[PDB]
Design an enzyme around this catalytic site. Structure first.
Site: not given
Lengths: 306, 304
Positions: B144, B42, B146
């Site tokens: 973030g 993503h 991620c």
């Protein structure tokens, strides 16, 4: 969900860990540039510990007396000298992995990560706090001495602690990277015990702010209180008397939430008396006191510089 | 005598693999091993996209040029790409010299690991957690994180098990294994999904109570033991996972050590449950911990 007590990335310090052996004794050592630091008692074994006289023992030691290895590679020691409870060994090699660094003595209540080691090899890394009684409640099994406590500020590592011994309590005593012990402990296996422990009020409060920062604010109320009246209450639940200095360390946090330090004190004052009602804070069951006002800021922001 | 800390592994070998992957105004972490760079797929989504995105569609309309990879102050020429489930596998020219011996392994709920929390491909901190029973994992992820990975270390071999993908509503986190396969009933889409009903990891709690005993603390024991089903009948009530004969066996060496029958330790738990911890403390804690596997205890009570 909740809040995690994160430890600094251990990379930079891992690259400075080495094994120091003196005869039958083996512990860890910090390799910074052309020097290796380690507990001075590396030069002991058996009953020496029951009150040695390092000066003499050292005076009868030579460079080849110390074997030191980084991985499966020896570092020839070419000099040696004692600095308080620490031993500084000179090596024929400068640590190319030496990070920008500095040594700072810590004050009771502050925190740092510890890279636990065994035979000069990293084992695990954890976050703890210099307890009000000057001891740490870490996990230092057999031969963790020499492991160090550090902090990181940008590209700079602030070594602040070095593990020496185990107090009966099941707690540890160590020094700063300048060979000075923390608390009234001496590196002699003699009858010595930790003083009385208290909860680090300042950190508990920093923790509530962090709670709040994250939307967990049910425990707040409309009233404040006197710094004095809070202490008369904390002193009963075993909290450390809160001070003006303390209230100030909480400034940035109090500023970011708009909740004045005393206001948050009244809040804590209750979570103490009026139990907690089975409710929670950042999930966990009890009030945590190992997050400083700086740790909360640090972790509630992926801060600048790069 | 005592002192039981929840330690994480040295992040050293992983830090040497953390990079930054940017695509458009979107940026997150990436893992770099040999000449491949992994990260959530993503990364290629902007606002809208995240609401039901046809990734197969979104990807073909992308090219190596779209992927900005940065190793500190050094860009890496992404020479090719491909998707593997929910991850992205960007090939590059420079092979990471700091790549350690690595293994990709799928962990199980209840199993523990170390997460190297990063923000912009830059190490920020390391912590030890457990894959919760509902597959999510409470962490210190904020904005973030991620792409940050979870792992284990044996000898010198790093075992990558998790990679952060998204922050679910409840405030917890979902992620996939290093093969893109998600842990849990989740998908990389901003939608109406929350964490399943979570439970406390009994096997671990018990281990922790053994750990608590071996260190010297045992104010919670009681010579009067219970049966296996009766414990469950009681635990299930307090929202603890049911205990199989398989868990009991697991607590084998931990019992044989402290010299306490698992079923006995269970009777002690049944009490700690009903008799709200006397207000006292176990292992300096004020609440029962379950982020310690029976193994995490052996490790931290014998060797390295």
């Amino acid at each position: 969900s909740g809040f995690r007590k994160m430890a600094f990335p251990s990379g930079k310090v891992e690259g400075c860990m080495v094994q120091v052996t003196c005869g039958t004794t083996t512990l860890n050592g910090l390799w910074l540039d052309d020097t290796v630091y380690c507990p001075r008692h590396v030069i002991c074994t058996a009953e020496d510990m029951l009150n040695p006289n390092y000066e003499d023992l050292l005076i009868r030691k030579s460079n080849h007396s110390f074997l030191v290895q980084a991985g499966n590679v020896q570092l020839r020691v070419i000099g040696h000298s004692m600095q308080n409870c620490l031993l500084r060994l000179k090596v024929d090699t400068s640590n190319p992995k030496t990070p920008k660094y500095k040594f700072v003595r810590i004050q009771p209540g502050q925190t740092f990560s510890v890279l636990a080691c065994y035979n000069g090899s990293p084992s695990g890394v954890y976050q703890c706090a210099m307890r009000p009684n000057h001891t740490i409640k870490g996990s230092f099994l057999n031969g963790s001495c020499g492991s160090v406590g550090f902090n990181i500020d940008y590209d700079c590592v602030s070594f602040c602690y070095m593990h020496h011994m185990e107090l009966p309590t099941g707690v540890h005593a160590g020094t700063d990277l300048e060979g000075k012990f923390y608390g009234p402990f001496v590196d002699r296996q003699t009858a010595q015990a930790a003083g009385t422990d208290t909860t680090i009020t300042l950190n508990v409060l920093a923790w509530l702010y962090a709670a709040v920062i994250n939307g967990d604010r049910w425990f707040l109320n409309r009233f404040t209180t006197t710094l004095n009246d809070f202490n008369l209450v904390a002193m009963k639940y075993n909290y450390e008397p809160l001070t003006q200095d303390h209230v100030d360390i909480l400034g940035p946090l109090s500023a970011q939430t708009g909740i004045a330090v005393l206001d948050m004190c009244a809040a804590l004052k209750e979570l103490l008396q009026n139990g907690m009602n089975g409710r929670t804070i950042l999930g966990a069951a009890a009030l945590e006191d190992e997050f400083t006002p700086f740790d909360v800021v640090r972790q509630c922001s992926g801060v600048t510089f790069q």
